[PDB]
């Protein structure tokens, strides 16, 4: 939301100094002259910058800062002196930074100078190349700092590389003149023997390594995984790396960004990846709800190649319909709250299917109308208004 | 044994889940269509098309 708004119009400036922001058509000196979208993005950027301050100075020290502010205010709140002490209930920026420096011993003045006083987000364009001879991974990260909303980042940058030997984090120092970052790569001895490949968490899984390159061990790369800067990343992986990142990652933002990047690769391996995500309980439900729409877009792009039925129809009849009647939907029992959301989002994406003539097929429209006719809600303890409203959608 | 013995018969029962779902669905759709057409005809009405 904030990178869309700041690249759209100028930027949000937390803590201006009194104009400080002249790129935008109102004055930021008073709350009653702000646009309402600017007020919303102001609150949004403020809580993300506080998450960044928690990233630099750990969460228990952050809660100690907040407790110190509240305790000064509550010792202030019981005095009777007319504001000799009632102004300890008012916080400022300098007092907040001083309380942070009191509890932690680190000051955050570079982070405050970059993300508060400066009003911009950063844009990262990354591309990699694997050097087989020296066994290194040559990243190439360049910033677009000449757009109207952007600024230049010179700090450190975390990158997480999943190779066959596991998941390794690397810190890169991205100075102004930097372009190529050579990080080292590990072995490929988990392709010699079939062993399980260890993940970002402590677990390990069986991966189908037939799509991987023979010479490179690395399975996927993520630039800034923890969202530790206010950034927009445009990484150029290979399509099998996006499919491996969609399947076997233990991070929902990486699964979402792989869904978002698989729309450019309409190959049938990506259709198999999104269909395996859709069939998979123990995936987070908002990833499957995105995989519905991604599968609809991919299915629209590979017409005159699609083999069987329309996308997600057989999967809908496998998950939510009767075993004896495929075209009759099961009676509504909405007590699971994840297959309820997936059930009410799957025909909405299924209706974006189009034939070679650019018209929605009469197999999906008939399916949606049979979902509407055979709807029986006399048996669940929950209402049907959102599911029926999504059927109209 | 039409002459000394006898036994009763019953009507053919339709215990099929498919046709029971179809019967309940079509009866609900027909009664709600009849209700909404009756309530739109005996009151103030709007129309998506001109004089419809």
Curated annotation (Swiss-Prot), chain A:
It is found in: Nucleus. Expressed in all tissues tested. It comes from the Eukaryota. Component of the TFIID basal transcription factor complex, composed of TATA-box-binding protein TBP, and a number of TBP-associated factors (TAFs), including TAF1, TAF2, TAF3, TAF4, TAF5, TAF6, TAF7, TAF8, TAF9, TAF10, TAF11, TAF12 and TAF13. Interacts with TAF2C1. Component of the TFTC-HAT complex. The TFIID basal transcription factor complex plays a major role in the initiation of RNA polymerase II (Pol II)-dependent transcription. TFIID recognizes and binds promoters with or without a TATA box via its subunit TBP, a TATA-box-binding protein, and promotes assembly of the pre-initiation complex (PIC). The TFIID complex consists of TBP and TBP-associated factors (TAFs), including TAF1, TAF2, TAF3, TAF4, TAF5, TAF6, TAF7, TAF8, TAF9, TAF10, TAF11, TAF12 and TAF13. TAF2 forms a promoter DNA binding subcomplex of TFIID, together with TAF7 and TAF1. It is linked to Neurodevelopmental disorder with feeding difficulties, thin corpus callosum, and foot deformity: An autosomal recessive disorder characterized by impaired intellectual development, microcephaly, delayed psychomotor development, pyramidal signs, thin corpus callosum, and foot deformity. PubMed:9418870 was unable to show an association between TAF2 and TFIID. Belongs to the TAF2 family. This is Transcription initiation factor TFIID subunit 2. It comes from Homo sapiens. The chain holds residues 401 to 800 of 1199 of the full protein.
Swiss-Prot record, chain B:
Signal peptide: none annotated. It is found in: Nucleus; Cytoplasm. It comes from the Eukaryota. Induction: Induced with triglyceride accumulation. Coiled coil: none annotated. 'Taube nuss' means 'empty nut' in German. It is linked to Neurodevelopmental disorder with severe motor impairment, absent language, cerebral hypomyelination, and brain atrophy: An autosomal recessive disorder with onset soon after birth or in early infancy. Affected individuals do not show developmental progress, are unable to sit or walk, do not acquire speech, have poor visual fixation, and show poor overall growth associated with feeding problems. Additional variable features include seizures, spasticity, and joint contractures. Brain imaging shows hypomyelination, thin corpus callosum, and cerebral and cerebellar atrophy. Belongs to the TAF8 family. Component of the TFIID basal transcription factor complex, composed of TATA-box-binding protein TBP, and a number of TBP-associated factors (TAFs), including TAF1, TAF2, TAF3, TAF4, TAF5, TAF6, TAF7, TAF8, TAF9, TAF10, TAF11, TAF12 and TAF13. Interacts with TBP, TAF1, TAF6, TAF10, TAF11 and TAF13. Component also of a small TAF complex (SMAT) containing TAF8, TAF10 and SUPT7L. Forms a heterodimer with TAF10. Interaction with TAF10 is mediated mainly via its histone fold domain while interaction with SUPT7L is via its C-terminal region. The TFIID basal transcription factor complex plays a major role in the initiation of RNA polymerase II (Pol II)-dependent transcription. TFIID recognizes and binds promoters with or without a TATA box via its subunit TBP, a TATA-box-binding protein, and promotes assembly of the pre-initiation complex (PIC). The TFIID complex consists of TBP and TBP-associated factors (TAFs), including TAF1, TAF2, TAF3, TAF4, TAF5, TAF6, TAF7, TAF8, TAF9, TAF10, TAF11, TAF12 and TAF13. The TFIID complex structure can be divided into 3 modules TFIID-A, TFIID-B, and TFIID-C. Ectopic expression of the histone fold domain acts as a dominant-negative mutant resulting in differentiation inhibition. This is Transcription initiation factor TFIID subunit 8. It comes from Homo sapiens (Human). The gene is TAF8. The chain holds residues 156 to 207 of 310 of the full protein.
